[PDB]
């Protein structure tokens, strides 16, 4: 199966979780493509992919509710071609804030609205992949069960 992991990371934690997931999922025997959202072009982004994993860290203040580069992507979700594609979301954040990883539900909500099938429960964790290998690895496993 072909998996795209697109992520937005401003201090590298979500980017870190994305690296790990690719690792874990490629060890499942799959072809994975890692994509920085700062380098992504929404238009037809999902073409050729069996599933798409979206990573977006949380930023409560100035930043309209999401990470920079992901916000520009998200806003063009309906150009991505998610209809009938497997999708899941993950994020790094901090519990000490009122809204912990609020972009996870949003991504699931939108993708679902566009004909996409959520295959795994949203990953909400703190720190990098090494901070919570177990949470990371449950997300990957869930994913691998639908591929
Ligand atoms: C100014 C600021 C506001 C933040 N607001 C939130 C927020 O409201 N919700 C949340 O879950 N995390 C929030 N965070 C915590 C970051 O999301 C956390 O450090 C995360 O792991 C960084 O993700 P990234 O390195 O992948 O970009 C905030 C961080 C900063 C410094």
CB 68 within 8 A of CB 10: yes
Q: Is the CB of 145 under 6 A from ligand 1?
A: no
Mind spelling out the 3-state secondary structure of 71-138? Answer: HHHHCCHHHCCCCCCEEEEEEEECCCCCCCCCHHHHHHHHHHHCCCEECCCCEEEECCHHHCHHHHHH
Q: Give dist(CA 138, CA 109) in Å, integer.
A: 21
Query: Whose CA is closest to 4, among 73, 51, 42, 71?
Result: 51
Say if residues 135 and 93 touch (Cβ distance below 8 Å).
no
What residues are paired with 34 via a beta bridge?
5
How many CB atoms lie under 10 A from the CB of residue 61?
A: 7
Q: Partners of 7 in the beta sheet?
A: 36, 55
Q: Look at residues 63, 33, 66, 64 and name the one whose alpha carbon lies nearest to residue 48.
A: 33
Cα-based angle 135, 34, 112 (whole degrees, multiple of 5):
65
Identify the domain containing residue 12 by its residue range: 1-147
User: Is-contact 115 89, C-beta < 8 A?
Assistant: no
CATH of the domain at 141: 3.40.50.360
Nearest CA to ligand 1 atom 23: 57
Tell me the resolution in Å. 2.5
Task: Among 60, 100, 130, name the best residue to mutate to test ligand 1's pocket (greatest count of ligand atoms within 8 A of Cβ).
Answer: 60
Number of separate domains in the chain: 1
* Residue 67 Cα: closest atom of ligand 1: 27
| Residue with the two structure tokens 């069996």 | 50
Ligand 1 atom at minimum distance from 58 CA: 17
Q: What is 22-65 written as a DSSP string?
A: HHHHHTTT-EEEEEEGGG---TTTTTT-SEEEEEE----STTTT
Method underlying the structure = X-ray
């Amino acid at each position: 199966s072909k998996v795209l992991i697109v992520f937005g990371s401003s201090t590298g934690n979500t980017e870190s979780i994305a690296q790990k997931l690719e690792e874990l999922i490629a060890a499942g025997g799959h072809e994975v493509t890692l994509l920085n959202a700062a380098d992504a072009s929404a238009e037809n982004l999902a073409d050729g992919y069996d599933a798409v994993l979206f990573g977006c860290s949380a930023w409560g203040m100035e930043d309209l509710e999401m990470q920079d580069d992901f916000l520009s992507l998200f806003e063009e979700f309906d150009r991505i071609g998610l209809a009938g594609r497997k999708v899941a979301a993950f994020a790094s954040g901090d519990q000490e804030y009122e809204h912990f990883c609020g972009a996870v539900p949003a991504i699931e909500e939108r993708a679902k609205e566009l004909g996409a099938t959520i295959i795994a429960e949203g990953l909400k964790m703190e720190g990098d992949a090494s901070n919570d290998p177990e949470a990371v690895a449950s997300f990957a496993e869930d994913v691998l069960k639908q591929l």
